[PDB]
């Protein structure tokens, strides 16, 4: 019927209306929104958002560290079968190696075969950018005109091997010994300066090789841009879907099956894709929060008492800010729940607890590749789950404040309509 009876049954609603009528309670909630936004998009260790982004990226990097060494790759620049091409990528987690060797000849690159070199180059560039970033520390979510320098090398040897030909990079026909080219390259809509150089090395007592050096100067390190790289990593793997043959250590957890095609890891890859997607959705709330900042104070006008039915045109914004913070918080938690081994089973669980959330280096800093990186995650997946959790627990008051602010504002928007 009427309101008295309704508030006799739901007193927290009565308290909500009292607050919605009181400019200083509204202003307090608007302050709280300012502070919790800063916790989410300005802080690092304390932000559930930051940790979720970090987990999503770490899970992709770690997937590759676990299986990269076992992944076949080979052939020439045209994506076809090579007779005798050995193409080696540095600072990658190979079998007892800090490089990965792509020398599978005669077999035809493609699905359930060796990954083509073109595809490995895409995967490698992404892995180097992520690893450089993780080593340096991810910035806060609000900070998105940061940049980093990334530099990586690879080599080509064997007759017929076209994967370091100068024309691939725009270098003079020859060229290949000492030649260099500097060129822009677009990465996530930003302009990066890129220097690619070539040398020929003739070691005294064995085969000649070509070395290519890529220097990326000004790669963006924003959350949005790095999650695009993690997406490129895990999708390149899933789409090229190459053949793999793993090597188990006797004793300790074991990988099944021992061979097949990488896209066969369907849960692992789906989970990492979901995590990235959720992290991207979450990072997209950043703009909504900034646009609807709550730092201006509110009241009546002309020194007249505050009227919740006419003076609350700010409420739509206040509601959108708070809804957006709460969406961040929930996607963050969702990211963690996709990968957290407490709720996994079968072969997926044993992949995460047995491989992804372990590391065989030696805790060495993030982004470090060693001769023992292979067949382990070495991306701080366990610590990142733990820290996401700790941050969420320390977000208890703020989460309540955000819900109270969303409710105050919803109440005023209601009064406001009519």
């Amino acid at each position, epitope marked *: 019927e009427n309101l008295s009876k309704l508030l006799t049954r739901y007193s927290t609603l009565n308290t909500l209306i009292k607050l919605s009528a009181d400019p200083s309670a509204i202003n307090a909630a608007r302050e709280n929104l300012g502070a919790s936004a800063k916790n989410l998009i300005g802080d690092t260790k304390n932000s559930p958002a930051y940790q979720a982004v970090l987990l999503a990226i770490n899970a992709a990097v770690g997937f590759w560290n676990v299986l990269g060494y076992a992944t076949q790759c080979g052939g020439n620049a045209n994506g076809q079968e090579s007779t005798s091409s050995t193409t080696i990528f540095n600072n990658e987690p190979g079998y007892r190696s800090t490089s990965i060797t792509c020398s599978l000849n005669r077999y035809k690159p493609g699905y359930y075969g060796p990954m083509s070199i073109e595809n490995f180059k895409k995967l490698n560039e992404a892995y180097q950018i992520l690893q450089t970033a993780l080593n340096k520390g991810l910035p806060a979510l609000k900070e998105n005109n940061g940049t980093i320098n990334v530099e990586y090398t690879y080599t080509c040897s064997g007759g017929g091997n076209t994967n370091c030909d100068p024309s691939l990079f725009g270098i003079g026909g020859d060229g290949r010994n000492g030649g260099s080219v500097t060129k822009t390259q677009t990465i996530d809509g930003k302009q990066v300066n890129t220097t690619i150089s070539s040398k020929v090395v003739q070691p005294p007592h064995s085969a000649a090789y070509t070395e290519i050096t890529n220097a990326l100067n000004g790669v963006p390190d924003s959350a949005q841009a790095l999650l695009a790289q993690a997406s490129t990593l895990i999708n390149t793997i899933n789409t090229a879907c190459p053949y793999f043959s793993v090597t188990n250590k006797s004793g300790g957890p074991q990988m099944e099956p021992t061979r097949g095609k990488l896209c066969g890891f369907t849960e692992e890859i789906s989970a990492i894709q979901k995590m990235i997607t959720d992290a991207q959705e979450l990072v997209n709330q950043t703009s909504v929060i900034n646009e609807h900042e709550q730092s201006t104070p509110v009241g009546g006008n002309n020194g007249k008492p505050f009227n919740p039915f006419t003076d609350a045109s700010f409420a739509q914004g206040m509601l959108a800010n708070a809804s957006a913070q709460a969406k961040m*918080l929930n996607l963050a938690h969702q990211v963690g729940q996709t990968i957290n081994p*407490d709720n996994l089973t079968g072969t997926f669980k044993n992949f995460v607890t047995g491989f992804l959330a372990t590391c065989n280096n030696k805790g060495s800093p993030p982004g470090t590749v060693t001769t023992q990186t292979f067949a382990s995650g070495c991306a701080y997946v366990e610590q990142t789950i733990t820290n996401l959790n700790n941050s969420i627990a320390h977000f*208890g008051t703020q*989460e*309540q404040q955000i819900q*109270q602010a969303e409710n105050i504002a919803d109440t005023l928007v209601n009064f406001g309509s009519h």
Partner: nanobody
Amino acid sequence: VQLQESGGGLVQPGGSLRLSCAASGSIFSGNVMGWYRQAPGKLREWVAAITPQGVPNYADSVKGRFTISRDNAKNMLYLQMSSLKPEDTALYYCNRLPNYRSWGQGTQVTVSS
């Protein structure tokens, strides 16, 4: 997808109480859990929380008086309250963090002489 609190009651100031929360596995397993309360005239207030690995943290108003704990084998959350005051009178609720959006009935705690 369910939450249920018990162990509240009327006590004397100085008194003490142990609350329990039975949570479903989908809510509890792998999730930060926590306690909350709703005092007369006020909105729900966060009180404490604890990570799956059992690390607790508390609001300033209860730090050093209350202790939250969890038993991961029975999907149970506990809150142990000492040196209770009349300020601590409220309906107490449990949930994960972040919150599942349907709350339990709560358990009433009243403190008075």
